[PDB]
Design a protein around this ligand. Structure first.
Ligand code: GNP
Ligand code: GNP
Ligand code: AMP
Ligand code: MG
Ligand code: MG
Lengths: 265, 307
């Protein structure tokens, strides 16, 4: 019976490893479900499920905007994780719920970044700010937040360029954008397909700037998004929304139960 | 001798190590079981240990996976394309945000630097800003490579029919255009798609079957996890099913991007060259045109063995 636990348990360690959960976390989850356990694949799979929930839940309630005040949300994340698309996704979400929302493009690097957000925003009938010419993200973000403040917007969402921890230059520029506009919520956007390099980057983001929420994108495919456990761990922030496709309404609020279910099999 | 029982633990440590360095979990497993089979019933060296023996075995098989039989000499292939008086067509493809468009620009720069003219075909006709993105690149490149620096010839140019049109047909008109305007290379950019989106994978297969490019390149981020394996399996499976040839045109080579973000968790390179037995043709190491590297198989394996 000591052999029927382990055989059923290394079979769960493998499912989680294949789902891109950090190996550190699996090695830890294994001897956690083992210590805490002292029809047979239910008495086990339940106690595993419970330990996984403890991992997605940071113990913190999620930030929410208040109607009638100025709420500034700033997006950050690795190159190509899906910030820009998720920006218009989130604006469209709040706008449909009757908030006065708008998007600002503070990417001055990515070729056609402003055109991208401008077309996204234009299709969804959402006010935007950005510049073809201005090269300092801090000036666009500043002059953008300042503009939409003066027009009494409730949700001002600021898109920023992709960056990664080893480019010290880019990480400073991020903190400088944060300090300039003083966001009420910083969102860390992450690709659900991310491998083991995830914990390192997410920690690095949280160490430099004040990440308070996480959005997981590209969950509509084959990836189960196990990197999210490490992202939640590193940023000490709840997953608030998931992205489920390329379109503006491929977006829904994160629910813990179905995600851990899909993560497990 | 060396039984499986003796190697059992050091092999387990290797597997866990490889996994931690971002080699796909099942590949690490298969990798280590190969090392077991290779060593079983053999005797060790005079001063070798069971650890040093499997460590060396693993290192050799890793080097061999990374440098596969078929190389891809791209400039040489373009030289040959020029003798036949046809353009050399390259198709980039891959899932969303991995770096197709930007590495297509880097490769253009490299080609121009060797004196070939490239027509960029904007065949992502879907994602917001795809055309303007490539336009920005074309503008940046033909400032670096203007006509006044090449005897009056235009060396880069964008072929675009804007958003909404069939990708395959634009690719076709572009290749047709390159032939008539004298462009040495056509680089076809395609939209990002999930590997199991049937409609989109058929579209990708159609563009390839219809235009028979000289080189299909799969583009994958080095950040990717176990997804590296599934993306390639299903892309290659899609090119083979939605094709009506005897020996169908599969993925020819890999562009491993964002290598600058993974530190030494360099494992995705092993994941990709293990399933496709195709070479990593370029490694992407940043966001500028200069950030394009070849793949040093000895040195990548070195980084993977270390931690
Ligand atoms: N299938 C799918 N595609 C998505 C999802 N979110 C974004 N995408 C696609 O992923 C790609 C990358 O998105 P994008 O917003 O450009 O990334 P980014 O990280 O904001 N930009 P940057 O390159 O500056 O880092 C685009 O093709 C986008 O439409 C999602 O949830 N599902
Ligand atoms: N650090 C780093 N960033 C890279 C590298 N290659 C591309 N990027 C960045 O990653 C993001 C992806 O860019 P893009 O080329 O638009 O990717 P894509 O696959 O064409 N996206 P889409 O799916 O929408 O077509 C860009 O911000 C680009 O600057 C690389 O090697 N290193
Ligand atoms: N990356 C993509 N490339 C091409 N078509 C897509 C992509 N993602 C989604 N689609 C589909 O293409 C169609 C275009 O819809 P629309 O952009 O609203 O005109 C819809 O059926 C989408 O589901
Ligand atoms: Mg972006
Ligand atoms: Mg592209």
């Amino acid at each position: 019976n000591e052999e029927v636990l382990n055989a059923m348990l290394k079979e769960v360690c493998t499912a989680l490893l294949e789902a891109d959960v950090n190996i550190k976390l699996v090695k830890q989850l294994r001897e956690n479900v083992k210590s805490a356990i002292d029809n047979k694949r239910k008495m086990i799979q339940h106690a595993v499920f419970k330990e996984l929930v403890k991992l997605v839940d940071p113990g913190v309630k999620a930030w929410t905007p208040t109607k009638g005040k100025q709420n500034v949300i700033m997006f950050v994340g690795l190159q190509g994780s899906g910030k820009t698309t998720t920006c218009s996704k989130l604006a469209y979400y709040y706008q449909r719920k009757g908030w006065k929302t708008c998007l600002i493009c503070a990417d001055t690097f990515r070729a056609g970044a402003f055109d991208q957000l401008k077309q996204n925003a234009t299709k969804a009938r959402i006010p935007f700010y950005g510049s073809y010419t201005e090269m300092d993200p801090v000036i666009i973000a500043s002059e953008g937040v300042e503009k939409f403040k003066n027009e009494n917007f409730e949700i001002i969402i600021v898109d920023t360029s992709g960056r990664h921890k080893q480019e010290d230059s880019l990480f400073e520029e991020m903190l400088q954008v944060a300090n300039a506009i003083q966001p009420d919520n910083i969102v860390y956007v992450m690709d659900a397909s991310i491998g083991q390099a995830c914990e390192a980057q997410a920690k690095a983001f949280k160490d430099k700037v004040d990440v308070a929420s996480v959005i997981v994108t590209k969950l509509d495919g084959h990836a189960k998004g196990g990197g999210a456990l490490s992202a939640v761990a590193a940023t000490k922030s709840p997953i608030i929304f998931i992205g489920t496709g390329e379109h503006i309404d491929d977006f829904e609020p994160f629910k813990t139960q179905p995600f851990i279910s899909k993560l497990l099999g | 001798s060396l039984s499986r029982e003796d190697m059992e633990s050091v092999l387990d440590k290797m597997r866990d190590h490889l996994i931690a360095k971002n080699v796909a979990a099942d590949i690490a497993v298969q990798l280590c079981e190969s090392v077991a089979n290779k060593l079983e019933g053999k005797v060790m060296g005079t001063f070798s240990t069971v650890t040093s023996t499997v460590k060396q075995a693993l290192q050799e098989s890793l080097v061999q996976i990374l440098q596969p039989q078929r190389r891809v000499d791209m400039l040489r292939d373009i030289m040959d394309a020029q003798r036949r008086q046809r353009p050399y067509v390259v198709t980039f493809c891959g899932v969303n945000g991995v770096g197709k468009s930007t590495n297509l620009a880097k490769i253009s720069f490299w080609l121009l630097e060797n004196g070939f003219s490239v027509l960029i075909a904007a065949c992502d006709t879907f994602r917001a800003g795809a055309v303007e993105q490539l336009r920005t690149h074309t503008r940046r490149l033909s400032a670096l490579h203007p006509p006044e620096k090449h005897g009056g010839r235009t060396m880069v140019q964008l072929f675009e029919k804007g958003y909404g049109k069939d990708a395959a047909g634009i690719a076709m008109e572009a290749i047709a255009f390159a032939r008539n305007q004298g462009f040495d290379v056509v680089l076809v950019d395609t939209a990002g798609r999930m590997q199991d989106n049937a409609p989109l994978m058929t579209a990708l297969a159609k563009l390839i079957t219809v235009n028979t490019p000289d080189l299909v390149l799969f583009v994958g981020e080095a950040l990717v996890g176990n997804e590296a394996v599934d993306q390639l399996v299903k892309f290659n499976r899609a090119l083979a099913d939605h094709s009506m040839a005897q020996t169908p045109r599969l993925i020819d080579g890999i562009v491993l991007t964002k290598f600058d973000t993974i530190d030494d968790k360099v494992g995705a390179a092993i994941s990709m060259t293990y399933i496709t037995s195709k070479p990593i043709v370029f490694v992407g190491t940043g966001q500028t045109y200069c950030d394009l590297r070849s793949l040093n198989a000895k040195a990548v394996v070195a980084a993977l063995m270390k931690a």
